[PDB]
Amino acid sequence: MNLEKLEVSHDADSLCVVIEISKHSNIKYELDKESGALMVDRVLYGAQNYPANYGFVPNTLGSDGDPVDALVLSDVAFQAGSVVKARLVGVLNMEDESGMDEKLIALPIDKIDPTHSYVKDIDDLSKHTLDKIKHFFETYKDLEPNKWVKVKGFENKESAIKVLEKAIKAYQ
Amino acid sequence: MNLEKLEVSHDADSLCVVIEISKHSNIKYELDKESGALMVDRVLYGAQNYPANYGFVPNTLGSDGDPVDALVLSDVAFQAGSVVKARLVGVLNMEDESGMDEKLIALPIDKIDPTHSYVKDIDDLSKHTLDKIKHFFETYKDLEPNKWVKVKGFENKESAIKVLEKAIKAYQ
Amino acid sequence: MNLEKLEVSHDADSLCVVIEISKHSNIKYELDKESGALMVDRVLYGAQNYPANYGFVPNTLGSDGDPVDALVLSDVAFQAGSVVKARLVGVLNMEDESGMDEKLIALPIDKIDPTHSYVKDIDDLSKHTLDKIKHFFETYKDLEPNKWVKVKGFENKESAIKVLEKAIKAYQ
Amino acid sequence: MNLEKLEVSHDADSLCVVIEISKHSNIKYELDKESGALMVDRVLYGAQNYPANYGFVPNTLGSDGDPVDALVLSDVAFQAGSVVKARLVGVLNMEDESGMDEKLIALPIDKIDPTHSYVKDIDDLSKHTLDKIKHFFETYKDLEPNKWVKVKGFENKESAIKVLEKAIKAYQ
Amino acid sequence: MNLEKLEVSHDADSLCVVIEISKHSNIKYELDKESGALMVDRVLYGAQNYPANYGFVPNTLGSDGDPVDALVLSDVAFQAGSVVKARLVGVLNMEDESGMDEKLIALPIDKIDPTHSYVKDIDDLSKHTLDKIKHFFETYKDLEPNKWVKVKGFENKESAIKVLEKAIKAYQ
Amino acid sequence: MNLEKLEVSHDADSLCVVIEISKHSNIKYELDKESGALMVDRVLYGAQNYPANYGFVPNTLGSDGDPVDALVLSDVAFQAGSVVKARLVGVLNMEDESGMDEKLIALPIDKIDPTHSYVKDIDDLSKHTLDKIKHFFETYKDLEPNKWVKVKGFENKESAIKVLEKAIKAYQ
Helix, strand or coil, X not given: CCHHHCCCXXXXXXXXXXXXXXXXXXXXXXXXXXXXXXXXXXXXXXXXXXXXXXXXXXXXXXXXXXXXXXXXCCCCXXXXXXXXXXXXXXXXXXXXXXXXXXXXXXXXXXCCCHHHCCCCCHHHCCHHHHHHHHHHHCCCCCCCCCCCEXXXXXXXXXXXXXXXXXXXXXXX | CCHHHCCCCEECCXXXXXXXXXCCCCEEEEEECCCCEEEEEEECCCCECXXXXXXXXXCXXXXXXXXXXEEECCCCCCCCCCEXXXXXXXXXXXXXXXXXXXXXXXXXXXXXXHHHCCCCCHHHCCHHHHHHHHHHHXXXXXXXXXXXXXXXXXXXXXXXXXXXXXXXXXXX | CCHHHCCCCEECCEEEEEEEECCCCCEXXXXXXXXXXXXXXXXXXXXXXXXXXXXXXXXXXXXXXXXXXXXXXXXXXXXXXXXEEEEEEEEEEEEECCCECCEEEEEECCCCCHHHCCCCCHHHCCHHHHHHHHHHHCCCCCCCCCCCEEEEEEECHHHHHHHHHHHHHCCC | CXXXXXXXXXXXXXXXXXXXXXXXXXXXXXXXXXXCCEEEEEECCCCEXXXXXXXXXXXXXXXXXXXXXXXXXXXXXXXXXXXXXXXXXXXXXXXXXXXXXXXXXXXXXXXXXXXXXXXXXXXXCCHHHHHHHHHHHCXXXXXXXXXXXXXXXXXCHHHHHHHHHHHHHCCC | CCHHHCCCCEECCEEEEEEEXXXXXXXXXXXXXXXXXXXXXXXXXXCECCCCEEEECCCCCCCCCCCCEEEEXXXXXXXXXXXXXXXXXXXXXXXXXXXECCEEEEEECCCCCHHHCCCCCHHHCCHHHHHHHHHHHCCCCCCCCCCCEEEEEEECHHHHXXXXXXXHHCCC | CCHHHCCCCEECCEEEEEEEECCCCCEXXXXXXXXXXXXXXXXXXXXECCCCEEEECCCCCCCCCCCCEEEECCCCCCCCCCEEEEEEEEEEXXXXXXXXXXXXXXXXXXXXXXXXCCCCCHHHCCXXXXXXXXXXXXXXXXXXCCCCEEXXXXXXXXXXXXXXXXXXXXXX
């Protein structure tokens, strides 16, 4: 694709998110800005698999040299490489070997899939949900040499929203 | 099915193993001796999935009130409920909330699938392989309340063989 | 002594390690660069004692503001303050209240003590050996207020080697 | 020796205690009633060592099928096998894998060693003292398969005294 | 009073329960069968207080030499000494220094107080409720010398019902 | 109220203490500096209640970002929000999830209530008294998720005094 010519939406409730990892995939792909090609970045060393679609937000820069990463919780898996509009429902803050790499939590626009419209904010997520996600991120790199992750916890939409604009200006 | 009328093989290189979990399945089934029906025992609380087919050996009793559990490493997934002939290549010893529940390591008879005939003993497994399996077992129950697991390590076929007979007499 | 005028060896199989804690000692000494004097850093609050000689590598800087710490497994205890040539056989990765402080695993040069020449790499260590050390590190600070330790696990020589050079350049 | 022909003292302030583990020893010996020979019972799996002399009281039966165990806090280590007169200053209650195995807390008769005469009752023990002992018991068997310990806490002399007579009648 | 001339009801849903401790009281009274007078049995050594009315069931004998103890969860406190008709909703099983002393869980007859009619069985109790009660019993005697309590957990009405008849026949 | 215009006394034997929790109350209130209003901070999850009036010392800063907390043992309960002059008789040191939060032990000026004038220092408190308070603090948060407390023990007036000035300069 061509991120350059892609209408980007930065509305908390209409967020343009490029997917890189489809839910349940243990293969971590990674789009390369120039080619626009998916780069197989790494296979999960352990017997695990992403708890939800994972991607990143176009035209944003956060404390990690890369745009702010994001999750789009849903019952389906969006083909790695596809694009989807989501809404910020919260965010999972954590630090790892590089430093602070927060992870915005989100769902697709109801227009796309109203299955979980009711989840208006982070507290609207089952406990189990939050646990599996947290535990995942704090264990999906145990077997990776020279690589760790310390998961702080989740936060509400407002916080996320903040994290958002924060990285947005940090972009240009 | 009817475990009662099933020819059981206890030859280390011809071991009759009833499967209960097909590779990659995050659903832990569990056959009930009387009904002969698969009982959904539990779904992985975490974003994980078995690293290889898991089942148990017929007519054997080990330190856990259940027949000795077993893994049948293979590139394919055997339909939960099916039966397969394997051969002991080792065993992963560990203890959990209940106590000592060793897990035999095995592959299907070459006649069935010669893909990995060359793996004559535990040392013939890729490091990664052993790591993924070990790590799995020592984290697949983190989120389960009142439930832990301490994985000791692996052992050679000989050790396994022992564990086997040990539980075999312990049966009748 | 005078670390400044000490021939340092950074060959994985000829590593110059300054000892600070002799095996079995519950007294954690700590050399001070300027004075070159052993500083009693702290006495084990618990009823324990180091599983092997503990020291550090001269002229190296790791993620802890201090040179990469190291262990020199042997049957004898080297006088705290002495220097010894070891060889990297692995490394124990872990994180604590400060962050990531890996611990190189090593033995003295066979020329010095050929007792355990055969241990060419981490896997050549008795399970028990690895357990006592791991457990030790993950419990030797329970009683210490505002201080914790999360032991990840061990790794092979190669990994260690890497960890080494990594901190070596990080030095100058 | 011959426990049978040994004048036993059951006075709280003149208690006959047979030692089986000298302070700092990581070797847990265990006298056999008939032979009267020290039986090496087990070596500490971890990098620890007893915080004080450990023994048991002759001709007493507690809830563990064995005479009530006891500690004899002192600055020295009494040769495993030796006998010593102590006085009850308290007791450390706890339960483990078998059940309830309380541990009397005591010191030798001042006549023998007046170093700590002032410690008339449990409260007279430094905090650190009590912590190290408690911690010890609740971690000296972590690495032991199928074996745990839950340490409740300590109690005053009166309590201990009770525990004593209780197991004393429970003897004959 | 005169337990002897008191119409006793042993219907699971019309259980005659003599109160000895009113909810929130830290004073444990204890009726004496002959005098029919409340015996102050003991004051809570700790800064606690009963989570609900406590008493016992007339003309019943359980494994403790005393009638089966019982709780009558309600928003009010019944004057120690008074009698009340409850209904078994479950039971909290536990063991202590003496042995097995189960504690029936119950509420008063709706006719008396319909506030919690809807709680038809143990599961109908708020988590918090069950926690505070469990925790209470497993900590209300920490400071009591030579006295402990191991709380197993709760069970459904059916279980309780059983425990009931069990101790009822065990009476005469 | 208005802490700002309140004559504060920092004399060990004339200590100005703002009460926030009246003895026996299970409701932990918490004055807010600006509003001067009692903030209901939290209700005891367990079946407990404070062993004595709890409050804090005005214009003081300790290692917890809050003024140094304090207890005013007395037979009566002072209306949460009221102010009272006490005298340091000791202090209970302890650490929790946050860190070191010592708790000054004190009584009201004899002029106010001479009932316990005789208690000149920590040793003058009944054992029971000290046990119930210690045990309380080390169990009043068991049921609280992500929250623990490690009670070291008590100390004499002198110690307390120290702790006082310490936090006093730490204020301005």
